[PDB]
């Protein structure tokens, strides 16, 4: 089923626009926030918004944003923290992470770390 990403750092779903840009809302009717979790290999996952039909990819320079193409850039290890929240972190950039900070806007890749309550997700139905 779909499903969408609750972030433990203010509350917010991450959103995947139809242009392309990420961010997070508290509004869980939102269209945008619907997302396809799907498994590639053991343990990594690619994630698609739903009605934007566009993949999320965290760039060399931290930045996050969703392309119609599926990159290497595109793969993420997903985890369940010891305290059941999971963790989404790149493949290719191997210390970044997927990310919100509590104003609902997306925190670079290359400022976060474990430890931190703006990586922590909690993916609901």
Not at 67 to 74: L, M
Not at 78 to 91: A, D, G, I, K, P
Not at 99 to 104: D, E, F, M, S
Request: with cysteine; net charge positive.
């Amino acid at each position: 089923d779909p499903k969408r990403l609750y972030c433990k750092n203010g509350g917010f779903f991450l959103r995947i626009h139809p242009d392309g840009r990420v961010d997070g809302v508290r509004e869980k009717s939102d269209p945008h926030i619907k997302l396809q979790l799907q498994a590639e290999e053991r343990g990594v996952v690619s994630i698609k918004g739903v009605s934007a039909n566009r993949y999320l990819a965290m760039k060399e320079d931290g930045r996050l944003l969703a392309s119609k193409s599926v990159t290497d850039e595109c793969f993420f290890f997903e985890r369940l923290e010891s305290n059941n929240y999971n963790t989404y972190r790149s493949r290719k950039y191997t210390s970044w992470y997927v990310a919100l900070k509590r104003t609902g806007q997306y925190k670079l890749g290359s400022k976060t770390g474990p430890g931190q309550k703006a990586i922590l997700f909690l993916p609901m139905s």
